[PDB]
Amino acid sequence: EKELLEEMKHPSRARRAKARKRLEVVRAFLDSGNRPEWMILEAVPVLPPDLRP
């Protein structure tokens, strides 16, 4: 987050737009409390049998 905040001061419009999009995902993870490594599955849930009868 601290690196992306420094790139937010660049004169180029494209650089500031790209750093904002990366920061939005980083901010969402920091505020929610989720961990980024939870996006890779280790155990797969199984639906209850009555909903797949």
Partner 1 sequence: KGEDVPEPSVPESFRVLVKELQALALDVQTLDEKDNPVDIFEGLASKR
Stretches 8-16, 20-28, 45-53: which one binds partner 1 (CB under 8 A)?
45-53
For residue 14, which phi and psi values (nearest 5 degrees)?
-65, -40
The reply to whether 41 sits near partner 1 by the rule CB under 8 A is yes
Q: Of 32, 33, 47, 49, which lies in the binding site for partner 1, with binding defined by CB under 8 A?
A: 47
If you write DSSP's letter for every residue of 6-24 in order, what string do you get? HHTT-S-HHHHHHHHHHHH
The reply to whether 37 sits near partner 1 by the rule CB under 8 A is no
Residue 19: other Cβ atoms inside 10 A: 18
Query: Contact positions toward partner 1, by CB under 8 A?
Result: 41, 44-48, 51
